[PDB]
Amino acid sequence: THLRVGWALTEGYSPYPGGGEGWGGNGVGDDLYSYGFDGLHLWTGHVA
Amino acid sequence: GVEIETISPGDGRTFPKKGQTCVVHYTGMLQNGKKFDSSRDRNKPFKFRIGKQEVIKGFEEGAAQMSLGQRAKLTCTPDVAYGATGHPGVIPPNATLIFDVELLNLE
């Protein structure tokens, strides 16, 4: 189960439910425009 | 080299007694991000007894360091796990492994 807390831009961050990028299921931390962390580790640019 | 980082907290006191089966759920994936096995997909808890060489020695050691009701992310050195030649068609040679094991029950 996935749950991230963080912030995002109004233009760069465009979540489309579907393929996205990487393995799929891109959240706030996956987008480089947005910044967020999930529990233990932070997420920026789709890398933990 | 095993590094047992704690994904979530589990009762610290409980620890795997020697010569006892450990009921675990594991989701192993490669270093680069490719996922190759997931015990949740099999819908059955994988069972293995500590002290035997059935499972990878690094995995058994990490489970020994792990505690009941606690999930962790642990990395196994390729020399420990399928060093010279990997499992054919599954793990490439000289490649590291990443696991995610939960010790739900010890019975």
Q: How many CB pairs under 8 A join A and B?
A: 6
- Structure's resolution in angstroms: 3.8
Residue B69 CA to residue B8 CA, distance in Å, equals 9
C-alpha B101/C-alpha B6 separation (Å) is 10
Any A CB within 8 A of B38 CB: no
Looking at B1-107, list the stretches that DSSP marks H as alpha helix, in order from N- to C-terminal side: 39-42, 57-65
* B79 annotated active-site: no
Domain with residue B82: its CATH number is: 3.10.50.40
Q: How far, rounded to the nearest angstrom, does the alpha carbon of residue A6 sit from its chain's CA centroid?
A: 9
Residue pair B48/B25 in contact by the 8 Å Cβ criterion: no
Give the nearest chain A residue to B5 (CA atoms): A40
Question: Own/partner pairs for A23-31, CB < 8 Å, 24+ apart?
Answer: A23/B33, A23/B35, A27/A2, A28/A4, A29/A4
The single residue listed with the structure tokens 């996205």 is A20
CB distance B9 to B67 below 8 Å:
no
Based on the structure, what is the number of domains in chain B?
1
Determine the structural domain holding residue B39 and report its residue range. 1-107
